[PDB]
Amino acid sequence: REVMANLTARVVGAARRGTLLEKRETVKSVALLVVTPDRGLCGSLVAN
């Protein structure tokens, strides 16, 4: 967490702000991650 803070502060130029950290403009496709229990009986947690 602090290594990100220490490193990303140094790298501020948009030209070198590529690859994963690149804040792309005109977003078109979005992927999402969901984690759920393997087994039920958890209650409303899975539904939530």
Place this chain on the structure above:
Amino acid sequence: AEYFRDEGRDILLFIDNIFRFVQAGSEVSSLLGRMPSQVGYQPTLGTEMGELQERITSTKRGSITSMQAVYVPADDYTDPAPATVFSHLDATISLERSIAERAIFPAVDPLASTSRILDPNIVGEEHYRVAQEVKRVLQRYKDLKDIIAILGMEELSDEDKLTVQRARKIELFFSQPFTVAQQFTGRPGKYVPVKKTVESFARLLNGEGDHIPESFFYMQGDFDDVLAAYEASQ
């Protein structure tokens, strides 16, 4: 009433609490020295019920549209008097204590209430289909009552869940204000024609009204009134 039936006039007959007739017969028999049967009832229970009830019949000369009431002792439907009444009726309506305690004033149990003319050739194909679906739902609900009570809604499957909230909405929707209930309830009475009832329940079973919360079906008229109330509350 038999004089008016025999000359052709249509008669509406309202006998209230046949069970009191049975209880009077039981007390008379106990005083008469007859041997008691079952829970203190008269040995001649079936014959007395036959003699009274077989006179309440629409014949070829006139028609009697009877409507009786029966009081179950305590809450026992296995009592000899209601058990004897059950086989002398065309349409049976069962009022349950739990439904009334849930503030559903009609308190009719659809599963335990049947009728002979609930036949597509007599009442209408759509009416019959709607009634059969409204019973298959709430039958699924009675099957899942224990599951819901001990675990909760979550463990059921998605279709089972949907049927469960549809059953609860139907149970709430069977309630209806009565014009004679103004004395202790401020809700004005409603008269929902059978066509409107069938249409409302068909729409509710289709899926329409799923988004509406269950509390909006309490003591309403047809489905249009429920939709209007939902719009009023936005």
